[PDB]
Amino acid sequence: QSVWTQPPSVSAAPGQKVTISCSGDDSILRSAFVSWYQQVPGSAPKLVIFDDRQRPSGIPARFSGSNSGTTATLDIAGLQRGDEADYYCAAWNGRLSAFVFGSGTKLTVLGQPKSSPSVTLFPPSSEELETNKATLVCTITDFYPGVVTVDWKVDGTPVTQGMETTQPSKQSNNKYMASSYLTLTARAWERHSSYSCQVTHEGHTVEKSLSRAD
Amino acid sequence: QVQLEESGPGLVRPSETLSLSCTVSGFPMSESYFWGWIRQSPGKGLEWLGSVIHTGTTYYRPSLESRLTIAMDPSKNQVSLSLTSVTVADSAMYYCVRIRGGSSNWLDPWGPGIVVTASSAKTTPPSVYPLAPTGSSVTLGCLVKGYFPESVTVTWNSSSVHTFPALLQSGLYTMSSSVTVPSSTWPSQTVTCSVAHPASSTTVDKKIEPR
Amino acid sequence: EPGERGLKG
């Protein structure tokens, strides 16, 4: 594939152990040396594992790696506050003949109870409708950990364009917020009748919908 | 210590060519290491663009190979990138990296990175559209659409405020603000966002109305 | 070959 598959979120308390996994088609990873990179907000990626399981100078032995070939893994034990970051796997893909990264995993080192998002779904203003543009706004607040997946449906159909979602941002209370935007033409707003914003957080989805005639 | 620094334009017009370069310090490029470019689009993942070694051997991202040129000047401690016909989708953080090649293919170290924004827009103040809705408290908002460049501040006169970060959409920024208040307070006591955009030196207000 | 980029041997 063009992008290795990692889980979006993994989390655990300080002192505990987590596994971040990385995979491609069949057993493609067996043919390559996997590397892993840590990225904290504001910084560039830092190398933390290379050649499947080697640690560079400065990396503690509680970080470890492996490449079973189907699935590569980054295993971090004795979790500390400073391990909370995005982690990306990477490896050469000789079928594409390119260097491929994984989709990233946020490792949340748990510092509070888990919290489900509060979703609000706003309709487009009539002011905006005079531009022949309609924007529906889905606000998502008070969630922890700070990883959501946002999916939209128009008349039960998954929306494949005209939708974009902000990266999650830290609130003042230290939970996370984000917003999502479905932009249509004003003609489309009149045509369709049902809209849903679906926010999935830790496997459970919270949904708000809005019908045109209301 | 081994240090990499990226330079180039922070703002380029679509259809123009993006020219970046990278300066290496404390390490010669005549060693058997590749020098390459990675990009990271905001709120998204990492994308290898390509790399080159002092012998002249070069590898590119296949999606972008026809538009990409990556070259190296070892005497000047420089690697470079040229990407023709820049698109809005090419807005990203751009990182320079040292790559151990062969079968290892590890990246260390990484430049701090350079933000590149692709937009044809002039300095543009935001249009400000109200967000408005059977419950004991109520949430309103202020949709702040189609401005350039960042930033805007939103301030309410009504209470818990949520200022959402901005999204680059097709060359123009979009952000939201929300405020939540008791249902007896609104519509009774009215509520107003004030949106400031320093780069356009404007300030727009919007009272939020019931539907 | 450290002069190339590729898969394991």
Short mmCIF file of C-alpha atoms in Angstrom, two decimals:
data_model
loop_
_atom_site.label_atom_id
_atom_site.label_comp_id
_atom_site.label_asym_id
_atom_site.label_seq_id
_atom_site.Cartn_x
_atom_site.Cartn_y
_atom_site.Cartn_z
CA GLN A 1 0.00 0.00 0.00
CA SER A 2 0.78 3.72 -0.26
CA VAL A 3 0.47 4.10 3.52
CA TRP A 4 1.11 1.53 6.28
CA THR A 5 -1.77 0.87 8.61
CA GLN A 6 -1.52 1.97 12.25
CA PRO A 7 -4.34 2.36 14.77
CA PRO A 8 -5.23 6.06 15.22
CA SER A 9 -5.28 5.96 19.06
CA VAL A 10 -3.61 3.91 21.75
CA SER A 11 -3.59 4.87 25.43
CA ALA A 12 -2.57 3.64 28.87
CA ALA A 13 -1.81 4.98 32.37
CA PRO A 14 1.73 6.03 33.41
CA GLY A 15 3.84 2.94 34.34
CA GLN A 16 1.90 0.65 31.95
CA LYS A 17 2.85 -0.87 28.53
CA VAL A 18 1.51 -0.16 25.01
CA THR A 19 1.99 -1.71 21.58
CA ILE A 20 1.71 0.45 18.45
CA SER A 21 1.39 -1.75 15.34
CA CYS A 22 2.19 -1.20 11.69
CA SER A 23 1.26 -3.36 8.68
CA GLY A 24 1.02 -3.62 4.92
CA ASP A 25 -0.32 -6.00 2.35
CA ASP A 26 0.28 -9.67 3.30
CA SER A 27 3.84 -9.99 4.69
CA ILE A 28 5.50 -7.13 2.72
CA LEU A 29 7.19 -5.71 5.85
CA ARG A 30 9.38 -8.82 6.16
CA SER A 31 11.41 -7.60 3.14
CA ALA A 32 12.35 -4.24 4.70
CA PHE A 33 13.83 -2.66 7.81
CA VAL A 34 11.20 -0.67 9.69
CA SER A 35 12.00 2.58 11.42
CA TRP A 36 9.84 4.49 13.95
CA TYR A 37 9.55 8.23 14.61
CA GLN A 38 8.26 10.20 17.57
CA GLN A 39 6.68 13.60 16.90
CA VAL A 40 5.68 16.00 19.67
CA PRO A 41 3.44 19.03 18.80
CA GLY A 42 5.66 21.87 17.52
CA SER A 43 8.64 19.64 16.64
CA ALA A 44 9.91 17.54 13.79
CA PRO A 45 9.91 13.72 13.94
CA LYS A 46 12.66 12.14 16.06
CA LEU A 47 14.03 8.67 15.24
CA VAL A 48 13.35 6.23 18.12
CA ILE A 49 13.81 2.78 16.50
CA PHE A 50 15.67 1.77 13.34
CA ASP A 51 16.50 -1.51 11.55
CA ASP A 52 13.36 -3.13 13.09
CA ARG A 53 14.60 -3.20 16.73
CA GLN A 54 17.73 -1.01 17.22
CA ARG A 55 17.69 2.00 19.56
CA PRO A 56 19.70 5.11 18.76
CA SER A 57 21.81 6.71 21.49
CA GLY A 58 19.54 8.45 24.01
CA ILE A 59 16.56 6.07 23.63
CA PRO A 60 15.80 4.00 26.73
CA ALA A 61 15.51 0.23 26.58
CA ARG A 62 11.86 0.32 27.67
CA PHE A 63 11.23 1.33 24.01
CA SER A 64 11.53 -1.75 21.80
CA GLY A 65 10.65 -2.81 18.26
CA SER A 66 9.98 -5.89 16.18
CA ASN A 67 9.15 -6.92 12.62
CA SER A 68 7.25 -10.21 12.40
CA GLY A 69 6.72 -9.42 8.68
CA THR A 70 2.95 -9.29 8.66
CA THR A 71 3.01 -6.72 11.47
CA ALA A 72 5.76 -4.49 12.84
CA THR A 73 5.44 -3.11 16.36
CA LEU A 74 6.72 -0.37 18.62
CA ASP A 75 6.40 -1.37 22.26
CA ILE A 76 6.86 1.29 24.97
CA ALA A 77 6.90 0.18 28.61
CA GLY A 78 6.97 2.19 31.87
CA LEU A 79 5.02 4.99 30.25
CA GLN A 80 5.95 8.51 31.28
CA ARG A 81 4.34 11.88 30.58
CA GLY A 82 6.99 12.68 27.91
CA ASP A 83 6.10 9.60 25.81
CA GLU A 84 2.76 11.21 24.81
CA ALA A 85 3.23 11.93 21.10
CA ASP A 86 2.42 10.87 17.55
CA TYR A 87 4.32 7.83 16.34
CA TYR A 88 4.88 6.95 12.69
CA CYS A 89 6.31 3.73 11.34
CA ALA A 90 8.22 3.74 8.07
CA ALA A 91 9.77 1.32 5.62
CA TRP A 92 10.83 0.90 1.98
CA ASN A 93 8.15 -0.63 -0.29
CA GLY A 94 9.83 -2.33 -3.24
CA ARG A 95 6.54 -3.01 -5.02
CA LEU A 96 5.90 0.71 -5.36
CA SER A 97 9.64 1.35 -5.20
CA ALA A 98 9.10 4.13 -2.67
CA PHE A 99 9.66 4.88 1.00
CA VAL A 100 6.36 4.57 2.84
CA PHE A 101 5.12 5.91 6.16
CA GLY A 102 2.35 4.69 8.37
CA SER A 103 -0.85 6.62 9.03
CA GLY A 104 0.30 7.67 12.54
CA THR A 105 -0.78 6.73 16.04
CA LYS A 106 -1.40 9.18 18.85
CA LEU A 107 -0.19 7.63 22.10
CA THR A 108 -2.10 9.30 24.92
CA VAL A 109 -0.50 8.78 28.34
CA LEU A 110 -3.69 8.87 30.42
CA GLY A 111 -3.97 11.89 32.79
CA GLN A 112 -7.77 11.91 33.38
CA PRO A 113 -10.85 9.74 32.88
CA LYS A 114 -12.06 8.98 29.34
CA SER A 115 -14.58 11.55 28.03
CA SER A 116 -17.07 11.29 25.19
CA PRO A 117 -17.45 14.21 22.76
CA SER A 118 -20.23 16.79 22.94
CA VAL A 119 -21.48 17.35 19.39
CA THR A 120 -23.51 20.30 18.13
CA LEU A 121 -24.63 20.54 14.46
CA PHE A 122 -25.53 24.01 13.10
CA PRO A 123 -27.39 24.74 9.84
CA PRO A 124 -26.12 27.30 7.29
CA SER A 125 -27.03 30.94 7.84
CA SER A 126 -29.41 32.62 5.38
CA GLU A 127 -26.66 35.29 4.92
CA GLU A 128 -24.34 32.61 3.62
CA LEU A 129 -27.12 31.18 1.46
CA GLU A 130 -27.16 34.50 -0.47
CA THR A 131 -23.63 33.58 -1.73
CA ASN A 132 -25.12 30.32 -3.14
CA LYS A 133 -23.02 28.46 -0.60
CA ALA A 134 -24.21 26.42 2.39
CA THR A 135 -21.91 25.43 5.25
CA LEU A 136 -23.04 23.09 8.02
CA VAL A 137 -20.85 23.21 11.13
CA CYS A 138 -20.28 20.29 13.49
CA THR A 139 -18.61 21.37 16.77
CA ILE A 140 -17.07 18.62 18.90
CA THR A 141 -16.00 19.46 22.46
CA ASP A 142 -14.96 17.96 25.78
CA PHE A 143 -13.36 14.74 24.50
CA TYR A 144 -10.46 12.73 25.86
CA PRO A 145 -8.38 11.15 24.56
CA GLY A 146 -8.00 13.69 21.75
CA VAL A 147 -8.66 11.42 18.74
CA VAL A 148 -11.91 11.30 16.78
CA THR A 149 -13.00 10.15 13.36
CA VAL A 150 -15.66 12.32 11.73
CA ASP A 151 -17.98 10.92 9.10
CA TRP A 152 -20.84 12.72 7.38
CA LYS A 153 -23.92 11.36 5.60
CA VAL A 154 -26.39 13.09 3.26
CA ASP A 155 -29.59 11.02 2.83
CA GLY A 156 -27.77 8.01 4.34
CA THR A 157 -24.85 8.27 1.86
CA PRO A 158 -21.21 8.66 3.16
CA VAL A 159 -19.89 12.03 1.98
CA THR A 160 -16.67 11.63 -0.07
CA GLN A 161 -15.90 15.32 -0.69
CA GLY A 162 -16.77 18.85 0.47
CA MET A 163 -15.99 17.85 4.09
CA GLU A 164 -12.95 18.68 6.17
CA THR A 165 -12.26 18.41 9.89
CA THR A 166 -9.80 20.36 12.11
CA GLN A 167 -7.00 18.58 13.94
CA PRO A 168 -7.91 18.13 17.66
CA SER A 169 -6.99 21.12 19.86
CA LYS A 170 -6.42 21.35 23.63
CA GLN A 171 -9.15 23.11 25.60
CA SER A 172 -8.44 25.14 28.76
CA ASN A 173 -9.93 22.36 30.91
CA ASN A 174 -7.34 20.01 29.19
CA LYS A 175 -9.90 17.93 27.26
CA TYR A 176 -9.97 18.26 23.44
CA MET A 177 -12.13 20.06 20.89
CA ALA A 178 -12.55 20.01 17.11
CA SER A 179 -14.92 21.22 14.40
CA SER A 180 -16.04 19.84 11.03
CA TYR A 181 -17.35 21.58 7.93
CA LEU A 182 -19.53 20.27 5.13
CA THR A 183 -19.66 22.88 2.35
CA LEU A 184 -22.35 22.52 -0.37
CA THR A 185 -23.98 24.78 -2.92
CA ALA A 186 -27.28 26.40 -1.88
CA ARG A 187 -29.07 24.38 -4.56
CA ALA A 188 -27.84 21.12 -2.96
CA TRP A 189 -29.04 22.30 0.49
CA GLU A 190 -32.60 22.55 -0.95
CA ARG A 191 -32.40 19.19 -2.86
CA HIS A 192 -31.28 16.93 0.04
CA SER A 193 -33.35 16.58 3.25
CA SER A 194 -31.30 14.75 5.93
CA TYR A 195 -27.77 15.47 7.12
CA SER A 196 -25.80 13.61 9.80
CA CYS A 197 -22.46 14.36 11.49
CA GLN A 198 -21.03 11.15 13.04
CA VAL A 199 -18.20 11.46 15.55
CA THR A 200 -16.48 8.21 16.53
CA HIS A 201 -14.43 8.33 19.77
CA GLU A 202 -12.79 5.23 21.34
CA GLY A 203 -14.99 2.96 19.13
CA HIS A 204 -18.39 4.50 20.11
CA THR A 205 -20.00 6.94 17.66
CA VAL A 206 -22.02 10.01 18.72
CA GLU A 207 -24.30 11.37 15.96
CA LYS A 208 -26.25 14.59 15.45
CA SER A 209 -28.56 14.99 12.52
CA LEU A 210 -30.65 17.75 11.05
CA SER A 211 -33.57 17.59 8.58
CA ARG A 212 -34.11 20.36 6.03
CA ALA A 213 -37.87 20.64 6.66
CA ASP A 214 -37.85 21.55 10.39
CA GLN B 1 26.44 18.47 16.07
CA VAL B 2 24.69 17.45 12.82
CA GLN B 3 22.18 20.23 11.91
CA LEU B 4 19.84 20.75 8.91
CA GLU B 5 18.11 24.00 7.98
CA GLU B 6 15.41 24.50 5.33
CA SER B 7 14.83 27.74 3.40
CA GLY B 8 12.54 28.90 0.64
CA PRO B 9 9.29 30.78 0.21
CA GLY B 10 6.58 30.51 2.86
CA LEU B 11 3.89 31.61 0.35
CA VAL B 12 3.74 30.57 -3.35
CA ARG B 13 1.13 31.03 -5.98
CA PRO B 14 -0.46 27.99 -7.54
CA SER B 15 0.98 27.08 -10.98
CA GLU B 16 4.37 28.55 -9.93
CA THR B 17 7.39 26.47 -9.00
CA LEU B 18 8.26 25.75 -5.35
CA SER B 19 12.03 26.03 -4.79
CA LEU B 20 13.38 24.84 -1.43
CA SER B 21 16.93 24.28 -0.29
CA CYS B 22 18.52 22.82 2.78
CA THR B 23 21.82 23.71 4.48
CA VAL B 24 23.79 20.96 6.29
CA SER B 25 26.19 21.81 9.14
CA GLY B 26 28.65 19.67 11.06
CA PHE B 27 28.51 16.78 8.56
CA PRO B 28 29.85 16.34 5.00
CA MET B 29 27.48 15.26 2.21
CA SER B 30 30.31 13.21 0.64
CA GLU B 31 29.65 10.45 3.19
CA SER B 32 27.49 7.55 2.08
CA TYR B 33 24.15 8.97 3.18
CA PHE B 34 21.18 10.16 1.15
CA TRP B 35 19.70 13.64 1.55
CA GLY B 36 15.92 13.91 1.15
CA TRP B 37 12.65 15.71 1.59
CA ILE B 38 9.58 14.76 3.58
CA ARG B 39 6.37 16.75 3.89
CA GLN B 40 3.54 16.78 6.38
CA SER B 41 0.26 18.41 5.48
CA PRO B 42 -1.51 20.09 8.49
CA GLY B 43 -3.31 17.66 10.83
CA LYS B 44 -2.13 14.78 8.67
CA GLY B 45 0.67 12.25 8.03
CA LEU B 46 4.16 12.10 6.60
CA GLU B 47 4.87 11.87 2.88
CA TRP B 48 8.32 10.96 1.50
CA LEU B 49 9.04 13.11 -1.56
CA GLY B 50 12.46 11.78 -2.52
CA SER B 51 16.19 11.76 -1.92
CA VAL B 52 19.65 12.01 -3.54
CA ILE B 53 23.23 10.91 -2.74
CA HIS B 54 26.56 12.48 -3.83
CA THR B 55 27.00 9.91 -6.64
CA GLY B 56 23.99 11.38 -8.49
CA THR B 57 21.54 8.51 -7.71
CA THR B 58 18.06 9.84 -7.06
CA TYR B 59 14.74 8.41 -5.90
CA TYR B 60 11.38 10.15 -6.13
CA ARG B 61 7.82 9.72 -4.89
CA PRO B 62 6.15 8.13 -8.00
CA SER B 63 3.00 10.34 -7.74
CA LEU B 64 5.17 13.47 -7.95
CA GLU B 65 8.20 12.29 -9.97
CA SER B 66 7.18 14.08 -13.18
CA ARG B 67 6.97 17.41 -11.29
CA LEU B 68 9.94 16.88 -8.91
CA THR B 69 13.65 17.62 -9.17
CA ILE B 70 15.86 16.93 -6.18
CA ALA B 71 19.58 17.70 -6.42
CA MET B 72 22.65 18.09 -4.31
CA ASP B 73 25.58 20.47 -4.21
CA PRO B 74 28.15 18.93 -1.80
CA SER B 75 30.60 21.89 -2.01
CA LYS B 76 27.92 24.26 -0.70
CA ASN B 77 26.51 21.73 1.84
CA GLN B 78 23.15 21.98 0.01
CA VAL B 79 20.33 19.67 -1.02
CA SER B 80 17.42 21.19 -3.01
CA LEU B 81 13.84 20.55 -4.12
CA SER B 82 11.94 21.95 -7.06
CA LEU B 83 8.20 21.12 -7.51
CA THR B 84 6.52 22.47 -10.68
CA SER B 85 2.91 23.70 -11.00
CA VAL B 86 2.23 24.05 -7.28
CA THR B 87 -1.33 23.07 -6.26
CA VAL B 88 -3.30 24.08 -3.08
CA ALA B 89 -2.86 20.45 -2.00
CA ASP B 90 0.92 21.08 -1.82
CA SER B 91 0.58 23.24 1.30
CA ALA B 92 2.56 21.47 4.03
CA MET B 93 5.44 21.57 6.47
CA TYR B 94 8.57 20.60 4.48
CA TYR B 95 11.39 18.75 6.25
CA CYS B 96 14.94 18.15 5.08
CA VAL B 97 16.47 14.81 6.33
CA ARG B 98 19.63 12.73 6.36
CA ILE B 99 18.90 9.18 5.23
CA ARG B 100 20.97 6.07 5.78
CA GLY B 101 20.07 4.16 2.61
CA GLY B 102 20.83 0.61 1.50
CA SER B 103 18.24 -1.57 3.24
CA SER B 104 18.23 0.48 6.45
CA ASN B 105 16.34 3.62 5.21
CA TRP B 106 16.31 5.49 8.56
CA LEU B 107 15.88 9.26 8.82
CA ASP B 108 18.10 11.12 11.28
CA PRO B 109 18.42 14.00 11.81
CA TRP B 110 15.52 16.14 10.62
CA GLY B 111 15.50 19.86 9.96
CA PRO B 112 13.08 21.83 12.13
CA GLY B 113 10.91 22.27 9.03
CA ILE B 114 9.58 25.07 6.83
CA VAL B 115 5.86 25.92 6.46
CA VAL B 116 4.87 26.33 2.81
CA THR B 117 1.40 27.74 2.01
CA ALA B 118 0.04 27.54 -1.55
CA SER B 119 -2.64 30.21 -2.14
CA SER B 120 -3.58 32.60 -4.95
CA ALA B 121 -5.47 34.84 -2.50
CA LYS B 122 -4.85 38.51 -1.71
CA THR B 123 -5.06 39.67 1.94
CA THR B 124 -8.79 39.04 2.46
CA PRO B 125 -10.92 39.89 5.53
CA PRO B 126 -13.35 37.19 6.82
CA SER B 127 -17.04 36.89 6.13
CA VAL B 128 -18.76 36.27 9.45
CA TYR B 129 -21.89 34.09 9.48
CA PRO B 130 -23.96 33.38 12.64
CA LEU B 131 -24.45 29.88 14.03
CA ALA B 132 -27.71 29.33 15.88
CA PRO B 133 -30.03 26.41 16.72
CA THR B 134 -35.40 22.59 23.98
CA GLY B 135 -32.66 22.35 26.69
CA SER B 136 -31.44 24.04 29.92
CA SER B 137 -28.47 25.84 28.26
CA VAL B 138 -27.73 26.81 24.63
CA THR B 139 -24.73 26.99 22.23
CA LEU B 140 -24.33 29.62 19.55
CA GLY B 141 -21.42 30.34 17.30
CA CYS B 142 -19.66 32.44 14.78
CA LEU B 143 -18.51 30.92 11.46
CA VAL B 144 -15.49 32.85 10.11
CA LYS B 145 -15.01 31.96 6.47
CA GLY B 146 -12.77 32.77 3.52
CA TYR B 147 -10.03 35.01 5.05
CA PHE B 148 -6.28 35.24 4.40
CA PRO B 149 -3.77 35.12 5.94
CA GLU B 150 -4.03 33.96 9.57
CA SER B 151 -4.84 34.94 12.27
CA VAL B 152 -8.19 36.10 13.61
CA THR B 153 -9.29 36.59 17.24
CA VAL B 154 -12.93 36.15 18.24
CA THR B 155 -14.35 37.78 21.35
CA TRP B 156 -17.88 37.55 22.72
CA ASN B 157 -20.06 39.92 24.75
CA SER B 158 -22.84 37.86 26.42
CA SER B 159 -20.17 31.66 29.89
CA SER B 160 -17.87 29.06 28.29
CA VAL B 161 -16.12 29.94 24.98
CA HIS B 162 -14.65 27.50 22.41
CA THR B 163 -12.22 28.89 19.81
CA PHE B 164 -11.65 26.24 17.15
CA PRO B 165 -8.41 26.27 15.12
CA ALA B 166 -8.39 27.32 11.51
CA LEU B 167 -8.50 25.13 8.42
CA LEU B 168 -6.82 26.01 5.16
CA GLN B 169 -9.53 25.29 2.56
CA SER B 170 -8.70 25.88 -1.13
CA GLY B 171 -6.34 28.79 -0.35
CA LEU B 172 -8.53 30.52 2.29
CA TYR B 173 -8.79 29.98 6.05
CA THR B 174 -11.96 28.94 7.94
CA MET B 175 -12.41 28.81 11.72
CA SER B 176 -15.25 28.70 14.27
CA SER B 177 -15.98 30.13 17.67
CA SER B 178 -18.73 28.91 19.97
CA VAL B 179 -20.14 30.18 23.26
CA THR B 180 -22.53 28.26 25.54
CA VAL B 181 -24.98 30.06 27.87
CA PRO B 182 -28.18 29.43 29.89
CA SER B 183 -31.43 29.34 27.85
CA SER B 184 -33.03 32.11 29.95
CA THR B 185 -30.12 34.45 28.97
CA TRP B 186 -30.75 34.02 25.18
CA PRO B 187 -32.65 35.27 23.25
CA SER B 188 -33.44 37.56 26.26
CA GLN B 189 -29.92 39.08 26.74
CA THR B 190 -28.44 39.19 23.19
CA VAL B 191 -25.06 37.74 22.16
CA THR B 192 -22.41 39.08 19.74
CA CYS B 193 -19.04 37.88 18.33
CA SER B 194 -16.44 40.48 17.41
CA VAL B 195 -14.01 39.13 14.77
CA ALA B 196 -10.67 40.95 14.35
CA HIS B 197 -8.37 40.35 11.35
CA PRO B 198 -5.12 42.41 11.98
CA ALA B 199 -3.57 41.75 8.54
CA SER B 200 -6.61 43.31 6.82
CA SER B 201 -6.92 45.65 9.82
CA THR B 202 -10.71 45.02 9.99
CA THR B 203 -13.09 44.15 12.81
CA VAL B 204 -16.55 42.68 12.04
CA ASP B 205 -19.32 42.12 14.61
CA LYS B 206 -22.39 39.85 14.29
CA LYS B 207 -25.38 39.62 16.63
CA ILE B 208 -26.70 36.03 16.60
CA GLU B 209 -30.47 35.77 15.91
CA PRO B 210 -33.12 33.05 16.52
CA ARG B 211 -34.52 31.31 13.43
CA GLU C 1 24.66 -1.24 -1.46
CA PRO C 2 24.76 2.01 0.61
CA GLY C 3 24.79 3.93 -2.75
CA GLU C 4 21.22 2.75 -3.41
CA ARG C 5 17.86 2.45 -1.38
CA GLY C 6 15.94 -0.79 -1.38
CA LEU C 7 14.86 -3.96 0.41
CA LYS C 8 16.68 -6.38 2.76
CA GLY C 9 19.20 -8.96 1.46
#
